[PDB]
Amino acid sequence: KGFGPIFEEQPINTIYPEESLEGKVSLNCRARASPFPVYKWRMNNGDVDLTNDRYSMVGGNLVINNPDKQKDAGVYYCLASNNYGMVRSTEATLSFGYLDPFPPEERPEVKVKEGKGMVLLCDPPYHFPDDLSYRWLLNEFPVFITMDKRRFVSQTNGNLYIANVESSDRGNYSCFVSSPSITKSVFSKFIPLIPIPERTTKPYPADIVVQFKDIYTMMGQNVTLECFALGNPVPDIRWRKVLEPMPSTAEISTSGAVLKIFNIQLEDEGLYECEAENIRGKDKHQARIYVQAFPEWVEHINDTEVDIGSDLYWPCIATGKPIPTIRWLKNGYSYHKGELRLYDVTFENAGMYQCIAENAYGSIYANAELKILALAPTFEMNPMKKKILAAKGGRVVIECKPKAAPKPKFSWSKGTEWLVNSSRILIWEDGSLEINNITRNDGGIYTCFAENNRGKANSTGTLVITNPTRIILAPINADITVGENATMQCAASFDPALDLTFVWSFNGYVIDFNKEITHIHYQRNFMLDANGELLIRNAQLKHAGRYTCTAQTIVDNSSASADLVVRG
Amino acid sequence: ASPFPVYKWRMNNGDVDLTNDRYSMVGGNLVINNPDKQKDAGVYYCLAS
Amino acid sequence: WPKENLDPVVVQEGAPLTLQCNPPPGLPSPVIFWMSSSMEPITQDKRVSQGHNGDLYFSNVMLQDMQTDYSCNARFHFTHTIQQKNPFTLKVLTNNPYNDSSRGVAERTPSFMYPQGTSSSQMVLRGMDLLLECIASGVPTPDIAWYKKGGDLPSNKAKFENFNKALRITNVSEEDSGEYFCLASNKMGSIRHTISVRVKAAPYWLDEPKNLIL
Amino acid sequence: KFENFNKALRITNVSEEDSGEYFCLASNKMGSIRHTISVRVKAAPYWLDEPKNLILAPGEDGRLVCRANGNPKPTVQWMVNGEPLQSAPPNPNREVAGDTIIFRDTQISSRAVYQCNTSNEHGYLLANAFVSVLDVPPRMLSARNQLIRVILYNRTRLDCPFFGSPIP
Ligand SMILES: *[C@@H]1O[C@H](CO)[C@@H](O[C@@H]2O[C@H](CO)[C@@H](O[C@@H]3O[C@H](CO[C@H]4O[C@H](CO)[C@@H](O)[C@H](O[C@H]5O[C@H](CO)[C@@H](O)[C@H](O)[C@@H]5O)[C@@H]4O)[C@@H](O)[C@H](O[C@H]4O[C@H](CO)[C@@H](O)[C@H](O)[C@@H]4O)[C@@H]3O)[C@H](O)[C@H]2NC(C)=O)[C@H](O)[C@H]1NC(C)=O
Ligand SMILES: *[C@@H]1O[C@H](CO)[C@@H](O[C@@H]2O[C@H](CO)[C@@H](O[C@@H]3O[C@H](CO[C@H]4O[C@H](CO[C@H]5O[C@H](CO)[C@@H](O)[C@H](O)[C@@H]5O)[C@@H](O)[C@H](O)[C@@H]4O)[C@@H](O)[C@H](O[C@H]4O[C@H](CO)[C@@H](O)[C@H](O)[C@@H]4O)[C@@H]3O)[C@H](O)[C@H]2NC(C)=O)[C@H](O)[C@H]1NC(C)=O
Ligand SMILES: *[C@@H]1O[C@H](CO)[C@@H](O[C@@H]2O[C@H](CO)[C@@H](O[C@@H]3O[C@H](CO[C@H]4O[C@H](CO)[C@@H](O)[C@H](O)[C@@H]4O)[C@@H](O)[C@H](O[C@H]4O[C@H](CO)[C@@H](O)[C@H](O)[C@@H]4O)[C@@H]3O)[C@H](O)[C@H]2NC(C)=O)[C@H](O)[C@H]1NC(C)=O
Ligand SMILES: *[C@@H]1O[C@H](CO)[C@@H](O[C@@H]2O[C@H](CO)[C@@H](O[C@@H]3O[C@H](CO[C@H]4O[C@H](CO)[C@@H](O)[C@H](O[C@H]5O[C@H](CO)[C@@H](O)[C@H](O)[C@@H]5O)[C@@H]4O)[C@@H](O)[C@H](O)[C@@H]3O)[C@H](O)[C@H]2NC(C)=O)[C@H](O)[C@H]1NC(C)=O
Ligand SMILES: *[C@@H]1O[C@H](CO)[C@@H](O[C@@H]2O[C@H](CO)[C@@H](O[C@@H]3O[C@H](CO[C@H]4O[C@H](CO)[C@@H](O)[C@H](O[C@H]5O[C@H](CO)[C@@H](O)[C@H](O)[C@@H]5O)[C@@H]4O)[C@@H](O)[C@H](O)[C@@H]3O)[C@H](O)[C@H]2NC(C)=O)[C@H](O)[C@H]1NC(C)=O
Ligand SMILES: *[C@@H]1O[C@H](CO)[C@@H](O[C@@H]2O[C@H](CO)[C@@H](O[C@@H]3O[C@H](CO[C@H]4O[C@H](CO[C@H]5O[C@H](CO)[C@@H](O)[C@H](O)[C@@H]5O)[C@@H](O)[C@H](O)[C@@H]4O)[C@@H](O)[C@H](O)[C@@H]3O)[C@H](O)[C@H]2NC(C)=O)[C@H](O)[C@H]1NC(C)=O
Ligand SMILES: *[C@@H]1O[C@H](CO)[C@@H](O)[C@H](O[C@@H]2O[C@H](CO)[C@@H](O[C@@H]3O[C@H](CO)[C@@H](O)[C@H](O[C@H]4O[C@H](CO)[C@@H](O)[C@H](O)[C@@H]4O)[C@@H]3O)[C@H](O)[C@H]2NC(C)=O)[C@H]1NC(C)=O
Ligand SMILES: *[C@@H]1O[C@H](CO)[C@@H](O)[C@H](O)[C@H]1NC(C)=O
Structure with a gap:
């Protein structure tokens, strides 16, 4: 009653604040097995000393007290072992979050002409978490500077871009960065900005400063496009595709300088054109979008069990834009690096197999237990039913399905006869036994023998034959009008030992007689030694059709049909 | 009430000394510290004026 | 901020709420205020508002409140740094019947929330800015009015802040010392809280x- | 012995023999797990x-x-x-x-x-x-001229208690 290690929870790539309250950091590895899983961890593809006061362990989860940049940063992986083999967790990279504040420098006061925009550097300091959200503020913190076609805030550089300057744009301006990962928000020194007023403001052409470059990104991702230009007349920005239609999943937004793509598909690949215009002139930028895809499963493997010596093929299939490479780890180490077609299974092969699909980009795991069988046959679980019934002139079939390992050979024995493939008698390979057109001499004592390389098993069967249940009087066809009372005739002959029933069917659908609706028009009155007729009251158009009487017992069943026509 | 209610309590149809360290009051609710069989048992009623 | 696991708090339509910040130790006391994670400044009015201590106070929760999350934020003057507490969320419950042939809820008395009990003592130094707060809870948005024991309020120096829930004075002399109280007037009921303002002089x-x- | 439907184990008088490391299995159809306990047998x-x-x-x-x-x-x-x-x-x-x-x-x-x-x-x-x-001569603490009876192949005892200042 064995069972291999199976994972529930696996570790994730993780990040710890340098200046944290928490002095403890933790990684999860959770699994289940019949012999409890035993856990090992490795650091940078190298062993870790288990008890160091600093380091400690709890139920597969690893703990470090007072972790240090200098020491603990690296890639950790978790090995769940038992008696049946080893299984590697997903690679988990551990880093220390870094977010120093800005350079303390004074930022010079800024003077500009009305009608000419300008741009200010955030000066982003060192950061280990890269999920940076940028905005800009005025005088005091809570004030916020909003997106128009005039003003914009880059989400990559972190700077602020203005096309057209007005008297309202004067005052203090400060950068603002938030890291949601570590929940930290910091802001740069304020910069004074003054626009000198100018009447009959000097017009300037469209001038592209913010591009969106050739990018390789994965299937199904969120993707966002920045495109911005400058000039005295508020520049108008327009998006299109070169030589294809825009993807359905496109949203333009109010600003008209930012473009959303939900669920990038195969077809979106190619060039995208951004046209920045104004009253005076124009400019264009063309960008390359390359679609990729992480490896994603199609027929991931599952827990399989087979016999020894059987020729095996493991179907493992994933799909990626970069064609996936397949690796086969046996108990936490690579065993095969190609089509896992195996011949001549053995003792030692059995256990834990890991199918990994990695490309140039990403990797995905699939774990499976391959179990091996070599049991002697027993009838403990699926024994033979001792007693079986038969009628003359009818095909009859007997199950001999026990539980053996190497798919052994079969035999049947009638006391003083060995029975084999014949004209009317066949033993199909699954182990069951067929007989056609039975006779009185067939009834008797049969034994099923299951003959295995390693041991055999024998079960006993007793087979009795009875006088067949047949129909003496068949139903006769009838024609009537609407509202008539009709009768269908049926008589059968049978053996006293047997338990017999009568079943009436309409148009090859059995009347159940179990619900009150049917009894409205239909009635049954079985009597005598043979008599089993049916009555119909208040005939309708729908009632006309085929009526079949079936005399059914546990040995065989005999059927006979007739027709009913309705007029009016 | 529009002019907030003011509370008085009476013990055995008799007035109660308000601050006795023992006795104390909060928002119309009356409190006794270390109550004694000998002393505090009785019928109390509350007057909202 | 200490990384804490936050279940969102729930409420039936129109019950009172006290949303607690409790920052890690701060010298000086940081600038406290409330933000959405969407980075929008959060709805403040007579009905619902933030305390000087930094906690947020809902006299009565409404339907709309479910729209967005509420996150506490604290600025430290010197390092020019802001700390963001893990954001909260709320859920509302409606028992209003579906009136046939085309606020369907119960109205309720005021109650005191921040200054529990009738009385409290505060000490402010001479020449300093004196600041008092009173927090109520009634289904019809209560109105806070501030007054003084047997004496008129100096209108030249005092003013209402934070939608009438804060009173601020200029330099405080021994003249201003005494007993100040606050009324939470509301359609259904009304209540007073008293504060002993002892002015001690630097x-x-x-x-x-x-x-x-x- | 087992107590509390196999969730408690109890032993009688304990010695340093019993000291050591005991563990428990929570066998189940889906998974199974062991908890270890360091049983240090100390003593008043x-x-x-x-x-x-x-x-x-x-x-x-x-x-x-x-x-x-x-x-x-x-x-x-x-x-x-x-x-x-x-x-x-x-x-x-x-x-x-x-x-x-x-x-x-x-x-x-x-x-x-x-x-x-x-x-x-x-x-x-x-x-x-x-x-x-003390300084006293040896003294006889039992009855004089006792009569004691017993069968053949059975263990027997004669009680002749005594006492003296120096061990007599
Ligand atoms: C990157 O891209 C991913 C998408 O791949 C973004 O993922 C987003 O995640 C959130 C979180 O799961 C999704 O939010 C959901 O929000 C709904 C709230 O809306 C419901 O109520 C609205 C008001 O009545 C109503 O307008 C909604 O219907 C609109 O929106 C849906 C999409 O949600 C849209 O398909 C419709 O056409 C409408 O336009 C909707 O009725 C909330 O109900 C969801 O919770 C349900 O499902 C969760 C399980 O997911 C379940 O646990 C709950 O009990 C409940 O049943 C869910 O929170 C959001 O939709 C995703 N964005 C999408 C799909 O575009 C991710 O945000 C992007 N990155 C960044 C950084 O943003
Ligand atoms: C004594 O007599 C018995 C009975 O006649 C003999 O047993 C017969 O042996 C033959 C030959 O080996 C078997 O035919 C094989 O069938 C295989 C397919 O088996 C599956 O399907 C069978 C039928 O199922 C039908 O319906 C399903 C569901 O709709 C369909 O999917 C299916 O296609 C059929 O239409 C099932 O009965 C069976 O359990 C399986 O599920 C074939 O794959 C097989 O061909 C292979 O092997 C050949 C050599 O054997 C080889 O030439 C081929 O290239 C290929 O490799 C073969 O055709 C019968 O199944 C089996 N039982 C019968 C007929 O009842 C027995 O051998 C004989 N003893 C002797 C001679 O010593
Ligand atoms: C005077 O002192 C002697 C010696 O001490 C006593 O003899 C004992 O008598 C008892 C019976 O009262 C004996 O108990 C016997 O046990 C036998 C089995 O002994 C073996 O297994 C036991 C454990 O079960 C071991 O402890 C032991 O070492 C042996 O290995 C039984 O077979 C006996 O029953 C049969 O024989 C007796 C004989 O007297 C019959 O009367 C019974 O009807 C029966 O047929 C018996 O039960 C014990 O073993 C003896 N020895 C000791 C050392 O105790 C006398 O009892 C005592 N008084 C007298 C003699 O009057
Ligand atoms: C904190 O508050 C306390 C309490 O109010 C202040 O302390 C004392 O307060 C009393 C008022 O209760 C003052 O008494 C006043 O004294 C005045 C003296 O006159 C000079 O000072 C006036 C301002 O206090 C000033 O306006 C005046 O000039 C005016 O008239 C000129 C023409 O004549 C004109 O040109 C000027 O521009 C101006 O309009 C004089 O300079 C008197 O005039 C008042 O009527 C009143 O009697 C005390 O003086 C206050 N104590 C002191 C030491 O001055 C305390 O000052 C407050 N502290 C702060 C920092 O504000
Ligand atoms: C827990 O408490 C018990 C009870 O007080 C302690 O047992 C004492 O152990 C000491 C050390 O071994 C014994 O001294 C021995 O005595 C032997 C004689 O024992 C025979 O007679 C016993 C009745 O007086 C009888 O129970 C015993 O049978 C049992 O033990 C046999 C051991 O071989 C076993 O074969 C039998 O099947 C049965 O289980 C014997 O017939 C003697 O042979 C030794 O040489 C030695 O002198 C004490 O006698 C024990 N106490 C009593 C009342 O007999 C035990 O040590 C305690 N344990 C701890 C950890 O504290
Ligand atoms: C399949 O075919 C094999 C080989 O013929 C059968 O093996 C023996 O079959 C006989 C049939 O009569 C069995 O006798 C039966 O015993 C039943 C109860 O079993 C009792 O004896 C068992 C062992 O006896 C064997 O070993 C002794 C050793 O001294 C030999 O002397 C015997 O000859 C036997 O070989 C015990 O294990 C069991 O606990 C019982 O004490 C009884 O109920 C039946 O009425 C009948 O008398 C014989 O037991 C079988 N022996 C073995 C080793 O299998 C086999 O039973 C067949 N199986 C079936 C299902 O038919
Ligand atoms: C944007 O950044 C700018 C960068 O400096 C900044 O100037 C601007 O606002 C603040 O503006 C105030 C005044 O409005 C400045 O304060 C002044 O400081 C002077 C010395 O540096 C001082 O002499 C002056 O004094 C005035 O008042 C006294 C009476 O009290 C009178 O006697 C004098 O004659 C003067 O009239 C005044 O105090 C700040 O220095 C200045 N910078 C800050 C606060 O950082 C920023 N805000 C906006 C909206 O543009
Ligand atoms: C393995 O899983 C696939 C996908 O669910 C299923 O089609 C297949 O039949 C499974 N095979 C086994 C042996 O469970």
């Missing part, structure tokens, strides 16, 4: 010594 | 040799033994008529060493009741012992 120059030339 | 002090009363003739040598076994080892504390040994009336015959007290050439002097408190973190044990000096 040393100040009567005759400052000047240089002697002889 | 218990008497290995309890000091029994010393009867001596003038000039005979006696020693008091206070040996209690405990885990951790129990600390021995010596008092004389409930007075600290430090400030007790000085005696030349008396010699204290480790856990043992020695009187060589004992005399009428220093006749008192000595107390031993063997204690540790967990518990303590207290023992008293006194020395009595």
Whole structure:
């Protein structure tokens, strides 16, 4: 009653604040097995000393007290072992979050002409978490500077871009960065900005400063496009595709300088054109979008069990834009690096197999237990039913399905006869036994023998034959009008030992007689030694059709049909 | 009430000394510290004026 | 901020709420205020508002409140740094019947929330800015009015802040010392809280010594 | 034995034999898991040799033994008529060493009741012992001319109790 290690929870790539309250950091590895899983961890593809006061362990989860940049940063992986083999967790990279504040420098006061925009550097300091959200503020913190076609805030550089300057744009301006990962928000020194007023403001052409470059990104991702230009007349920005239609999943937004793509598909690949215009002139930028895809499963493997010596093929299939490479780890180490077609299974092969699909980009795991069988046959679980019934002139079939390992050979024995493939008698390979057109001499004592390389098993069967249940009087066809009372005739002959029933069917659908609706028009009155007729009251158009009487017992069943026509 | 209610309590149809360290009051609710069989048992009623 | 696991708090339509910040130790006391994670400044009015202590107070929760999350934020003057507490969320419950043939909820008395009990004591130093707060809870948005024991409020120096829930004075002398109280007037009921304002004075120059030339 | 539907295990009198490492399995169809417990069998002090009363003739040598076994080892504390040994009336015959007290050439002097408190973190044990000096001839403590009966192949006993100032 064995069972291999199976994972529930696996570790994730993780990040710890340098200046944290928490002095403890933790990684999860959770699994289940019949012999409890035993856990090992490795650091940078190298062993870790288990008890160091600093380091400690709890139920597969690893703990470090007072972790240090200098020491603990690296890639950790978790090995769940038992008696049946080893299984590697997903690679988990551990880093220390870094977010120093800005350079303390004074930022010079800024003077500009009305009608000419300008741009200010955030000066982003060192950061280990890269999920940076940028905005800009005025005088005091809570004030916020909003997106128009005039003003914009880059989400990559972190700077602020203005096309057209007005008297309202004067005052203090400060950068603002938030890291949601570590929940930290910091802001740069304020910069004074003054626009000198100018009447009959000097017009300037469209001038592209913010591009969106050739990018390789994965299937199904969120993707966002920045495109911005400058000039005295508020520049108008327009998006299109070169030589294809825009993807359905496109949203333009109010600003008209930012473009959303939900669920990038195969077809979106190619060039995208951004046209920045104004009253005076124009400019264009063309960008390359390359679609990729992480490896994603199609027929991931599952827990399989087979016999020894059987020729095996493991179907493992994933799909990626970069064609996936397949690796086969046996108990936490690579065993095969190609089509896992195996011949001549053995003792030692059995256990834990890991199918990994990695490309140039990403990797995905699939774990499976391959179990091996070599049991002697027993009838403990699926024994033979001792007693079986038969009628003359009818095909009859007997199950001999026990539980053996190497798919052994079969035999049947009638006391003083060995029975084999014949004209009317066949033993199909699954182990069951067929007989056609039975006779009185067939009834008797049969034994099923299951003959295995390693041991055999024998079960006993007793087979009795009875006088067949047949129909003496068949139903006769009838024609009537609407509202008539009709009768269908049926008589059968049978053996006293047997338990017999009568079943009436309409148009090859059995009347159940179990619900009150049917009894409205239909009635049954079985009597005598043979008599089993049916009555119909208040005939309708729908009632006309085929009526079949079936005399059914546990040995065989005999059927006979007739027709009913309705007029009016 | 529009002019907030003011509370008085009476013990055995008799007035109660308000601050006795023992006795104390909060928002119309009356409190006794270390109550004694000998002393505090009785019928109390509350007057909202 | 200490990384804490936050289940969102729930409420039936129109019950009172006290949303607690409790920052890690802060010298000086940081600038406290409330933000959405969407980075939008959060709805503040007479009905619902933030305390000087930094917690947020809902006299009565409404339907709309479910729209967005509420996150506490604290600025430290010197390092120019802001700390963001893990954001909260709320859920509302409606028992209103579906009136046939086309606020369907119960109205309720006011109650005191921040200054529990009738009485409290505060100490402010002479010349300092004096600041008092009173927080109520009634289904019809209560109105806070501030007054003083047997004396008129100095209108030149005092003013209402934070939608009538804060009173602020200028330099405080022994004149201003005494007993101040606050009314949470509401359609259904009304209640007073008293505060003992004892003004104790920091040393100040009567005759400052000047240089002697002889 | 099993108690509480196999979720509790109980043992009788415990010794250092039973000390060690015990664990428990939560076998189940889906998974199974072990918990380990370090069973350190420590002990409140218990008497290995309890000091029994010393009867001596003038000039005979006696020693008091206070040996209690405990885990951790129990600390021995010596008092004389409930007075600290430090400030007790000085005696030349008396010699204290480790856990043992020695009187060589004992005399009428220093006749008192000595107390031993063997204690540790967990518990303590207290023992008293006194020395009595008398000068009497041997005495017979049972009935004269006893009659005792017994069968052939069975164990038997004759009780002839006695006592004397020097061990007779
Ligand atoms: C990157 O891209 C991913 C998408 O791949 C973004 O993922 C987003 O995640 C959130 C969180 O799961 C999704 O939010 C959901 O929000 C709905 C709230 O809306 C419901 O109520 C609205 C008001 O009545 C109503 O307008 C909604 O219907 C609109 O929106 C849906 C999409 O939600 C849209 O498909 C419709 O056409 C409408 O326009 C909707 O009725 C909330 O109900 C969801 O919770 C349900 O499902 C969760 C399980 O997911 C379940 O646990 C709950 O009990 C409940 O049943 C869910 O929170 C959001 O939709 C995703 N964005 C999408 C799909 O575009 C991710 O945000 C992007 N990155 C960044 C950084 O933003
Ligand atoms: C004594 O007599 C018995 C009975 O006649 C003999 O047993 C017969 O042996 C033959 C030959 O081996 C078997 O035919 C094989 O069938 C295989 C397919 O088996 C599956 O399907 C069978 C039928 O199922 C039908 O319906 C399903 C569901 O709709 C369909 O999917 C299916 O296609 C059929 O239409 C099932 O009965 C069976 O359990 C399986 O599920 C074939 O794959 C097989 O061909 C292979 O092997 C050949 C050599 O054997 C080889 O030439 C081929 O290239 C290929 O490799 C073969 O055709 C019968 O199944 C089996 N039982 C019968 C007929 O009842 C027995 O051998 C004989 N003893 C002797 C001669 O010593
Ligand atoms: C005087 O003292 C002697 C010796 O001490 C006593 O003899 C004992 O008598 C008892 C019976 O009262 C004996 O118990 C016997 O046990 C036998 C089995 O002994 C073996 O297994 C036991 C454990 O079950 C071991 O402890 C032991 O070592 C042996 O290995 C039974 O077979 C006996 O029953 C049969 O024989 C007796 C004989 O007297 C018959 O009367 C019974 O009807 C029966 O047929 C018996 O039960 C015990 O073993 C003896 N020895 C000891 C050392 O105790 C006398 O009892 C005592 N009084 C007299 C002699 O009057
Ligand atoms: C904190 O508050 C306390 C309490 O109010 C202040 O302390 C004392 O307050 C009393 C008022 O209760 C003052 O008494 C006043 O004294 C005035 C003296 O006149 C000079 O000072 C006036 C301002 O106090 C000033 O306006 C005046 O000039 C005016 O008239 C001129 C023409 O004549 C004109 O040109 C000027 O521009 C101006 O309009 C004089 O300079 C008197 O005039 C008042 O009527 C009143 O009697 C005390 O003086 C206050 N104590 C002191 C030491 O001055 C305390 O000052 C407050 N502290 C702060 C920092 O505000
Ligand atoms: C827990 O408490 C018990 C009870 O007090 C302690 O048992 C004492 O153990 C000591 C040390 O072994 C014994 O001294 C031995 O005595 C032997 C004689 O034992 C026979 O007679 C017993 C009745 O008096 C009888 O129970 C015993 O049979 C049992 O033990 C046999 C051991 O061989 C076993 O074969 C039998 O099947 C049965 O289980 C004997 O017939 C003697 O042979 C030894 O040489 C030695 O002198 C004490 O006698 C025991 N106590 C009693 C009352 O007999 C035990 O040590 C305690 N354990 C802890 C950890 O504290
Ligand atoms: C399949 O075919 C094999 C080989 O013929 C059968 O093996 C023996 O079959 C006979 C049939 O009569 C069995 O006798 C039966 O015993 C039943 C109860 O079993 C009792 O004996 C068993 C062992 O006996 C064997 O070993 C002794 C050793 O001294 C030999 O002397 C015997 O000859 C036997 O070989 C015990 O294990 C069991 O606990 C019982 O005490 C009884 O109910 C039946 O009425 C009948 O008398 C014989 O037991 C079989 N022996 C073995 C080893 O299998 C086999 O039974 C057949 N199986 C079936 C299902 O038919
Ligand atoms: C944007 O950044 C700018 C960068 O400096 C900044 O100037 C601007 O606002 C603040 O503006 C105030 C005044 O409005 C400045 O304060 C002044 O400081 C002077 C010395 O540096 C001082 O002499 C002056 O004094 C005035 O008042 C006294 C009476 O009290 C009178 O006697 C004098 O004659 C003057 O009239 C005044 O105090 C700040 O220095 C300045 N910078 C800050 C606060 O950082 C920023 N805000 C906006 C909206 O543009
Ligand atoms: C393995 O899983 C696939 C996908 O669910 C399923 O089609 C297949 O039948 C499974 N095979 C086994 C042996 O469970």
